[PDB]
Amino acid sequence: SKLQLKLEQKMKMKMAKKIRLRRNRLMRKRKLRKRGAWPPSKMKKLKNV
Amino acid sequence: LKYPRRILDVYQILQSPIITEAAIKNIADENSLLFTVDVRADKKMIREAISNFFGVKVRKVNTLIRPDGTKKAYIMLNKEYNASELAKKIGI
Amino acid sequence: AALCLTKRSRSRKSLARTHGFRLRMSTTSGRALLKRRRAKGRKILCTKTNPSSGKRA
Amino acid sequence: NPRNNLISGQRRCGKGRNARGIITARHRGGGHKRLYRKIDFRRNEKDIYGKIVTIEYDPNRNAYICLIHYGDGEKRYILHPRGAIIGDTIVSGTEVPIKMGNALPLTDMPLGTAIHNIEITLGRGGQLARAAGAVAKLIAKEGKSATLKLPSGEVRLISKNCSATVGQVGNVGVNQKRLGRAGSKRWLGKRPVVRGVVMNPVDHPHGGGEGRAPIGRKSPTTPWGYPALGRRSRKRNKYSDNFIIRR
RNA sequence: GACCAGGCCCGGGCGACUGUUUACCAAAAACACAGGUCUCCGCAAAGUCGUAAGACCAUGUAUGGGGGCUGACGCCUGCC
RNA sequence: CAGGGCCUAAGAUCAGGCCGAAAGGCGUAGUCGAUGGACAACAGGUGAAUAUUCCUGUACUACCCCUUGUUGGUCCCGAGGGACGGAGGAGGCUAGGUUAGCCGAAAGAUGGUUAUCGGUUCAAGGACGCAAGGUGACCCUGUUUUUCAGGGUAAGAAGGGGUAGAGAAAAUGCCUCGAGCCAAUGUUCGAGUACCAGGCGCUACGGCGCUGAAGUAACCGAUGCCAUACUCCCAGGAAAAGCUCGAACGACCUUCAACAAAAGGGUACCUGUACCCGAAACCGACACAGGUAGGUAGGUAGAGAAUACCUAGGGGCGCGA
RNA sequence: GUGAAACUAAGUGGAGGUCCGAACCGACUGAUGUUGAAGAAUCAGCGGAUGAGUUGUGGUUAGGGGUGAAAUGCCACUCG
């Protein structure tokens, strides 16, 4: 009974983990768009500079 | 009630096709075709005025303004309809 | 340093918030200015910008 | 615990000085944002205890403030006095005994006591003697007034039904906290003041000529013409509640 | 071993100092400064702008807010 | 993708309200107002002028339809959160760089020599998961307390959960369970019948056509991520909406209507998009030895974004002899 | 080192209105340039460069005024 509760809390940990990491990676992508340095074509072409 | 954004005389929402060579490139290469519309137009009003007057499912409606004032509309039809067999009927 | 040059690359939005038609019509004084512009015969009674598009030319 | 949802947020922007935009309270500008602290001057919960959990630095004040809870679910800030033991309990009320930190109306108390936060009339938040060491004493009471020696060397009979937080208010050691970094004046949002001799006659009345100008006028004046030594700036008939100026 | 990359010491005057100042002839010994002192102000505060309502002061309360002069620090600051 | 269809700061306009010869001044609710907060796309190709926009691949948002349950649901209200400082240096790694391995070619008329010359590329996203990094509470033992070895506590983490008061959520007080937690990085799919050195066939000699090898390891090491992570300091570091939770009171609609999901399909609002942008196109009257916010930061020598010479890329400064 | 103090080796730490020096900001000297390349610059050095910093965007105060670390400075190459 208690291990199933630990699996429900673990499932809450997986759902909230995927949501928080999704929000974090999208906000990193917005922080790199706002500086003007996000798209890896515009960085991979400017690897030499 | 279902209002549009603006009531804009729907039998005049399209003005003229474009007969440049790049338009024929869009026909043979894109299954799309080129119209000249007025500035007061939509991706919802032009898109309805193609599936009714022509009888063709239109895929997308890529619009742009042109600095002489008038508006240009690249309309891409569905895969089921060739734009070349529907453009020779009009006169392209 | 810079030079003794006055106008620069300020956005036309901020030039239209000051010298545009709205702050020119929000006062009795500015609409009296438009009495003098329309009374003289100027084709462009304000120097503005547009929130949608740039220029039809 | 910062971000208490009691710091209250929106203010008028920094140490402002603009009435219509004209400089009217001079030498202001600069520093941090200095977000204010909405503290509980007029204690509207009487006869319920409350502990003390945090002594937070209010940047708006010269002293500190403290976060006080209650037995019910609330959070307030009050001026903590000298002697605020962490975890000590304060309680406002009408018959609450005298302790360094709690509040009570000015009637139900003896005379000759150290009190910081007093009221000049009923209903107000808190007016007098709330700085970083400002302590007001009580001379004996009267029928509906109370002669109170507030920390200017000044006595004042006052309305007796006024709330008062008994205690000597702490952070006295700002008498000796030196500003010796010499640009720390600018961190408080206080621009440098220019002096009247070294101005022009269009600006100040002591706009001089060659050299260190002597003061020239019969009296040292303000930049708006009034004499700035001895001339008491007080309306001749306002209250007549003060007994003697004693200054 | 190229480019790059402190000249220094001995005295004195002024300003303690870092800073700010006459955009386009003056960067200073000038202004400011930390510190000192006098003086006004008890909150419906003083002071400031406005005929007024009102606003800054201040959502602060004499360990605080104006205003005058002097300018760290050390010794003092006399007589009328 | 950037703004508007979302939100507010400074500030502006301010319904009523006060004031004032007039014009208008003050000021609350409210509404505008990005330089901020919220929200979903990357790689290759095409191309006289367009590319996160067009084509192809894999995705992700916001609603509808299709299946299970519910009788209430939405908004206003109550709350959490959004939500924030400066400096400091140490870790863990990525981006880039160098070297080595591998693959292809190479005789470049010189004394010798292959020691030489080019590739060694891959994103967003979907899954699985984190240590020798930080965090996890107290005491003893061994070691420089430390990385670790060992014992005990019943709370001592991320987190959940019960209650008690006028107490739905929250907050406060009490009790209990949980030894782990956090995030860059990472493996696989995307992803090769792509890209790519080379050779193979014609030149409008401007390029197209067919085929295609290896595509790994280690040392450095970021000013980029972890990271609003810790430590220190005073000069004490925005707001609102989106989001999440929830009783009473208040407005509306009610059964195949509303709400919450699980796969699968459908649908995709306006404006900006060229070009110059360390400038001949902007601002200095000039195709003016001047100015203009921000981003990317290769090699060698060097502490270094100075300097000297160079790869990429771009020029030879619009009078010459 | 004494029953505790006062004080000192040694590490750890990274404070500064610290120092050298780039971007950046500013303009001290000198030469050039004076129908200048430029209605205020070029060249060679120069002062600050974690702060009382610099700058972008959106604002604010408007002439019996504003603003001024105070020069009669600045308020569109114009300011008693």
Swiss-Prot record, chain A:
The ranges of region (Disordered) come to 30-49
Q: What is this protein called?
A: Large ribosomal subunit protein cL37 gamma
The organism of origin for this protein: Spinacia oleracea
Primary gene name: PSRP5
Curated annotation (Swiss-Prot), chain B:
Q: Where in the cell is it found?
A: Plastid, Chloroplast
Which processes are annotated in GO (biological process)? Answer: translation
Q: Name one GO molecular function term.
A: mRNA binding
First-to-last residue of the parent protein present: 102 to 193 of 198
Q: Could you tell me which cysteines form disulfide bridges?
A: none
Family statement = Belongs to the universal ribosomal protein uL23 family.
Identify the main location.
plastid
Write down any Gene Ontology CC term: cytosolic large ribosomal subunit
Q: Any remaining note in the record?
A: Two forms of the protein exist; they have the same N-terminal sequence and approximately the same molecular weight.
Supply the alphabetized keyword list: Chloroplast, Plastid, Ribonucleoprotein, Ribosomal protein, RNA-binding, rRNA-binding, Transit peptide
Q: Which domain of life is it from?
A: Eukaryota
**Descriptive protein name:** Large ribosomal subunit protein uL23c
Q: How does it assemble?
A: Component of the chloroplast large ribosomal subunit (LSU). Mature 70S chloroplast ribosomes of higher plants consist of a small (30S) and a large (50S) subunit. The 30S small subunit contains 1 molecule of ribosomal RNA (16S rRNA) and 24 different proteins. The 50S large subunit contains 3 rRNA molecules (23S, 5S and 4.5S rRNA) and 33 different proteins.
General function of this protein: Component of the chloroplast ribosome (chloro-ribosome), a dedicated translation machinery responsible for the synthesis of chloroplast genome-encoded proteins, including proteins of the transcription and translation machinery and components of the photosynthetic apparatus.
Swiss-Prot record, chain C:
Compartments, record wording: Plastid, Chloroplast
- Highest taxon, organism lineage: Eukaryota
**Self-association or partners: how does it assemble?**
Component of the chloroplast large ribosomal subunit (LSU). Mature 70S chloroplast ribosomes of higher plants consist of a small (30S) and a large (50S) subunit. The 30S small subunit contains 1 molecule of ribosomal RNA (16S rRNA) and 24 different proteins. The 50S large subunit contains 3 rRNA molecules (23S, 5S and 4.5S rRNA) and 33 different proteins.
Function description: Component of the chloroplast ribosome (chloro-ribosome), a dedicated translation machinery responsible for the synthesis of chloroplast genome-encoded proteins, including proteins of the transcription and translation machinery and components of the photosynthetic apparatus.
The Swiss-Prot or TrEMBL record describes its family as follows: Belongs to the bacterial ribosomal protein bL34 family.
Protein name per UniProt: Large ribosomal subunit protein bL34c
Shown residues within the full chain: 94 to 150 of 152
UniProtKB/Swiss-Prot annotation, chain D:
| Record GO biological process | mitochondrial translation
User: Keyword Plastid, does the record have it?
Assistant: yes
User: Where does the protein end up?
Assistant: Plastid, Chloroplast
Record-linked InterPro entries: NA-bd_OB-fold, Rib_uL2_dom2, Ribosomal_uL2, Ribosomal_uL2_bac/org-type, Ribosomal_uL2_C, Ribosomal_uL2_CS, Ribosomal_uL2_dom3, Ribosomal_uL2_RNA-bd_dom
Q: Name one Pfam family in it.
A: Ribosomal_L2_C
Family indicated by similarity: Belongs to the universal ribosomal protein uL2 family.
UniProt name for this protein: Large ribosomal subunit protein uL2cz/uL2cy
Q: Which organism is it from?
A: Spinacia oleracea
